[PDB]
Amino acid sequence: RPSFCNLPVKPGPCKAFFSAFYYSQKTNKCHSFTYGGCKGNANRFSTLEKCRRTCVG
Ligand SMILES: [Cl-]
Ligand SMILES: [Cl-]
């Protein structure tokens, strides 16, 4: 997988309520999170299938 998949999930400090997905090295799976809308990192996807295409297979 791309190395940025292994960055830690980062909701950030803002409090908007964006639905998103991230990859976890613990599971080799994508999971949901709530992105607050600012200061995130690249382990963040708008859809489950994009997270999977990028990080899972
Ligand atoms: Cl998955
Ligand atoms: Cl797809």
Give a short overview.
By secondary structure, the chain is an alpha+beta fold. The protein has 1 helix and 2 strands; from the N terminus they run ββα. The longest helix is centred in the last third of the chain and has 8 residues, at 48-55.
- Which kinds of small molecule does this entry bind, naming each only once? chloride ion
* Beta strands, count: 2
Number of helices: 1
| SS class | alpha+beta
User: What is the helix content?
Assistant: 10-25%
Q: What would you give as the CATH superfamily?
A: Pancreatic trypsin inhibitor Kunitz domain
CATH classification class: Few Secondary Structures
PDB class: toxin
Keywords: Vasopressin antagonist, mamba venom, kunitz, toxin
Assembly: monomeric
Entry title: X-ray structure of the mambaquaretin-1, a selective antagonist of the vasopressin type 2 receptor
